Amino acid sequence: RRRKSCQA
Amino acid sequence: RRRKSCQA
Amino acid sequence: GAMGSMERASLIQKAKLAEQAERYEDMAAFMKGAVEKGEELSNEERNLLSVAYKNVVGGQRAAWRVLSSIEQKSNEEGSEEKGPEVREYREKVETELQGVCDTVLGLLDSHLIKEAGDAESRVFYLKMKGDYYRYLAEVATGDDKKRIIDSARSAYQEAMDISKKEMPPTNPIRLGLALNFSVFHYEIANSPEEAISLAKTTFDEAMADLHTLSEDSYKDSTLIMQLLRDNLTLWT
Amino acid sequence: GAMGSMERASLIQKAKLAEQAERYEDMAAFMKGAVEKGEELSNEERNLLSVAYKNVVGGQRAAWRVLSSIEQKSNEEGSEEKGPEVREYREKVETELQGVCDTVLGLLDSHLIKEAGDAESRVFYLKMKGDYYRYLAEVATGDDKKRIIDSARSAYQEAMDISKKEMPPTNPIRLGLALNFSVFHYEIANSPEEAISLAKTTFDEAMADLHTLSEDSYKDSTLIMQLLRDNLTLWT
Ligand SMILES: *Cc1ccc(S(=O)(=O)N(C)CCS*)cc1
Ligand SMILES: *Cc1ccc(S(=O)(=O)N(C)CCS*)cc1
Ligand SMILES: [Cl-]
Ligand SMILES: [Cl-]
Ligand SMILES: [Mg+2]
Ligand SMILES: [Mg+2]
Ligand SMILES: [Mg+2]
Ligand SMILES: [Mg+2]
Ligand SMILES: [Mg+2]
Ligand SMILES: [Mg+2]
Incomplete structure (x- = not known):
């Protein structure tokens, strides 16, 4: 699980 | 359903 | 370059x-x-x-x-x-x-x-030539459209002739060529009956030759046969 | 051009x-x-x-x-x-x-x-400046790496200061900025505790302000809150 940045 | 051509 | x-x-x-x-x-x-x-x-x-x-x-x-x-x-x-x-x-x-x-x-x-000169290389390149003329044909609307379509047909036909003479019916290149030429017939050449006949004959002749193959070759051939079946199911 | x-x-x-x-x-x-x-x-x-x-x-x-x-x-x-x-x-x-x-x-x-000059545009552009310096920092290995990291930090910090003064805690730009600055802290600045604190405080302050929102705004804000929660679950 790769961390989330602000992406759709 | 789109017809198949030679693709992976 | x-x-x-x-x-x-x-x-x-x-x-x-x-x-x-x-x-x-x-x-x-x-x-x-x-x-x-x-x-x-x-x-x-x-x-x-x-x-x-x-x-x-x-x-x-x-x-x-x-x-x-x-x-x-x-x-x-x-x-x-x-x-x-x-x-x-x-x-x-x-x-x-x-x-x-x-x-x-x-x-x-x-x-x-x-x-x-070898069948595997020559058939592969002629298939590619048919494919890229087919992609040109997908966007063609002008006075050379007929000649673009004939160029795709001519390359596919030479590839088919060599592949039938020199390759087994289960060969993956032969199968992918037939798949693509059948798509050409269906959606470029306005020949759905030819497309269906080619897909069916190709599938059936490959089926009859599967018994000759190793497990790995069987997997390679059946994968492409399933694409032929997918198209037959869509088209019939 | x-x-x-x-x-x-x-x-x-x-x-x-x-x-x-x-x-x-x-x-x-x-x-x-x-x-x-x-x-x-x-x-x-x-x-x-x-x-x-x-x-x-x-x-x-x-x-x-x-x-x-x-x-x-x-x-x-x-x-x-x-x-x-x-x-x-x-x-x-x-x-x-x-x-x-x-x-x-x-x-x-x-x-x-x-x-x-408006908060929504200025915060958005400063967030972008932080992001693209952060992407430079992801590949930086040389003598300017510290200055690239500080440039990302400085842009994010100015965006945070404006967003806290001028935007509600549920504003999607404020939320996405905080998400990205928290990622900056975690994986660029070697500050996982700061990343976690920022994500938690941002989430909690947004939660408390959801009652003020329409249904559509609620959906916009909660979507980004879920990304903050995803990171907190990964990091803790
Ligand atoms: C800065 C910024 C950009 C896009 C968005 S978003 O389109 O609302 N969206 C949900 C992306 C995840 S942050 C929000 C903020
Ligand atoms: C001409 C050609 C190219 C690739 C292949 S494949 O890699 O075996 N594969 C299954 C693509 C679908 S035809 C076969 C034939
Ligand atoms: Cl290179
Ligand atoms: Cl244009
Ligand atoms: Mg040399
Ligand atoms: Mg042979
Ligand atoms: Mg008929
Ligand atoms: Mg003008
Ligand atoms: Mg305001
Ligand atoms: Mg701790």
């Missing part, structure tokens, strides 16, 4: 890295540079060339279809006039796509096909 | 078509041309600019990570020497990525940020 100073083996190595990184434009440029070294391509190298360009054009074709659909809607009754932008941008993508097809056809003509 | 002869409105129209066709390189070039017309951008236009470049760099970053992992494996004990190709190709992708980041930072500096 720009790959002229890089070693053939380094171009191949980088094409494989580009594939792993899903950088298909880079992959295609590396493989073009490798072809332009002037030596024949091995089986693996031919596959790298084909994968690279099929992915590049495949993306262009998908984008072209999106834009063509928007343009077609714009020309329906009751649609507001929005200016030349949709046509211009569809034309931009179309011209880029045609350029890539011309690039591949140029590599095949100078000089991959003329040096290819 | 090449978009200088196209109308601003046509560039915007084509950027929207390019988005529909998933032609993000074209989308970015159209939006760069629109910015270079010299007028401020509307909310929708700022979103088109951001979407375009985030998709272009996002693809480059993913490719860079694939190549960097291959290179790192090549430098482990017992790995065969394969020559300079992996490093060269990783450097090629890296240089392209840095070029796109420099392009975005240049648009922000000339002259998007200096003309942006």
